[PDB]
From Swiss-Prot, chains A, B:
Protein name per its UniProtKB record: 3C-like proteinase nsp5
Localisation per UniProt entry: Host cytoplasm; Host Golgi apparatus; Host nucleus
Residue ranges of every copy of the Peptidase C30 domain listed in the record: 1-304
Substitution effect: residue 205 to V: In strain: Zeta/P.2
Parts of the chain on the Cytoplasmic side: 1-304
Catalytic activity from the UniProt record: TSAVLQ-|-SGFRK-NH2 and SGVTFQ-|-GKFKK the two peptides corresponding to the two self-cleavage sites of the SARS 3C-like proteinase are the two most reactive peptide substrates. The enzyme exhibits a strong preference for substrates containing Gln at P1 position and Leu at P2 position
Role description: Cleaves the C-terminus of replicase polyprotein at 11 sites. Recognizes substrates containing the core sequence [ILMVF]-Q-|-[SGACN]. Cleaves and inactivates human TRMT1, preventing tRNA guanine(26)-dimethylation of tRNAs. May cleave human NLRP1 in lung epithelial cells, thereby activating the NLRP1 inflammasome pathway. May cleave human GSDMD, triggering alternative GSDME-mediated epithelial cell death upon activation of the NLRP1 inflammasome, which may enhance the release interleukins 1B, 6, 16 and 18. Also able to bind an ADP-ribose-1''-phosphate (ADRP).
Cross-link (Glycyl lysine isopeptide (Lys-Gly) (interchain with G-Cter in ubiquitin)), chain numbering: 5, 90
Consequence of changing residue 189 to A: Does not affect ability to cleave and inactivate human TRMT1
Shown residues in whole-protein numbering: 3264 to 3567 of 7096
Amino acid sequence: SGFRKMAFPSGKVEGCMVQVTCGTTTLNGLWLDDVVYCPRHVICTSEDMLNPNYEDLLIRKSNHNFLVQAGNVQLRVIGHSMQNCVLKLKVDTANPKTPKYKFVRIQPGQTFSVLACYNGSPSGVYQCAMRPNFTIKGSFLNGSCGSVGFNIDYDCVSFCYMHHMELPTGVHAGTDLEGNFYGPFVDRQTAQAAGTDTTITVNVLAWLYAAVINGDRWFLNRFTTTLNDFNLVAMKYNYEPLTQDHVDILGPLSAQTGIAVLDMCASLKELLQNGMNGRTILGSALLEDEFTPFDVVRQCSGVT
Amino acid sequence: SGFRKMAFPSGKVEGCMVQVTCGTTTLNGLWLDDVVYCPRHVICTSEDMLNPNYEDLLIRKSNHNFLVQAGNVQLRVIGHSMQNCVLKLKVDTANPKTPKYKFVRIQPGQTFSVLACYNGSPSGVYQCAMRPNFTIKGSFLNGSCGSVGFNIDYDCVSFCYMHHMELPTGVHAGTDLEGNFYGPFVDRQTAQAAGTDTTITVNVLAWLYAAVINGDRWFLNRFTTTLNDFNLVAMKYNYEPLTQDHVDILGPLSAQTGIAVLDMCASLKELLQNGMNGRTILGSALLEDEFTPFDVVRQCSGVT
Ligand SMILES: Nc1cncc2c1CCCN2C(=O)Cc1cccc(Cl)c1
Ligand SMILES: Nc1cncc2c1CCCN2C(=O)Cc1cccc(Cl)c1
């Protein structure tokens, strides 16, 4: 019983964190096998960030200009290349702590854990979601670049995010592990505005199912709705449209509780229209959208 | 920028998790040096839990009746003793992954990270607080007993909690690593009710300072108050009384923001009296009390 914003155990990722310095810029790198992955803006000075030509700036850098430190020991850089917005530094030593891993590009609405790091050292772990506007609401300070986002399936770490940038609004942008930014963001010190941060409806529904499983049931109403009727309401409240794909994914939660997906949509519709009236659900006074239906099943079943 | 409920990186604790089985009961153990610590109710059947005499039940158990498995390998139990509500199983092998560690008994209001485990395997990490009624609001399923709570200072893990029990209300109770329960709880299948779960005022104030640091400032008012006036309001809203010790601990946050502690108390007083009016602070529609002033300083400074 109880429901928490839970992150994956970070050990497997902690074993991969390294410090990468180029010139006077220091950030985090991810050491997997004999490659260290880091944001390409490690080669930039603050002045370079205004309008960087990364290919040009990289010509002035050789293998010995990239200082990679794993713990208190120096790794020897024997090759370097740029893949989109990430640098791949080939080192002469495979990371002995390399876990089984994959690189995945996630969809908006998907959740992951972040191991926030500074100087190659882990400071904390938290759970977040890729927003529908392709930003993340993280907790990152200067030096946090190169910290990564990931999910774990038994013994396999799927790396999905690498932190690159803070927007002028204090929200965060980054890339997958192939260096492609999520969303339209560019690694440049130029004002970039994020789009509408809509609520991830399927995740709110998953969290309403988690609340019923854990005993918070006051919000269950006597109504039902249709996908089209619900979506008219969802549109009005800047919620993402619900599709039959989302209904399908909520099926195991509907089966466990005996509450039809469309009945739960009608409960959500009434909560949107009437508010919480000073009440709480799972210790929250607002509708939580950073738990996927998979996260709810995982937490409520105890997958390790 | 950004503010998250952040847990400590769990790696150091993951390396200590083991599975302990006695008869047909299986739970988690914490392997540090050559000792495995686990809840004493590992020796109980479900029938025994109704009215257990642990000293009597333990007479029927020998070293070979405790099966300790670390990963997929079996540890040899060469001694066993009961210390309060925990069993200490001496094994013939020191844990090679034992981090630098201390056992601490925390005060109510203090926060810690929990590495929730099942069958000796970590499932997730989350941050919580020792409530003023000595319960924790965790996320624990059957098999989670023996999962631990901890804090980390650079390379030293301070273990503060070991999970033992779920109360009939779905809140959690457990012990320090010396086996002494927090609060008046007993390891028995008997209905035990928790006292008033008051709000940890000093933590709410720390989180209001975190909000100002991160740009959420709408709640700052033109008023000030006194400790006695504030505490009259705090009493009325089931908030813990604020003392000069709490004011002293908020000093670094007051210094960073230039907002006197008593001015922040007056802002909190108005929020209690007027509510949030549909607004949010740091993404929350309620006042958060699971961040200590130390946690806010740590997250806002990037301690690793
Ligand atoms: N607090 C914080 C969090 N996450 C990143 C950053 C900060 C503060 C300063 C460093 N930083 C950046 O965003 C630096 C940067 C500038 C322009 C483009 C890119 Cl790719 C990066
Ligand atoms: N869901 C859950 C979470 N945390 C613990 C437990 C559960 C469900 C069943 C196991 N369990 C217990 O509390 C078993 C127990 C009974 C009586 C006294 C003590 Cl010390 C322990």
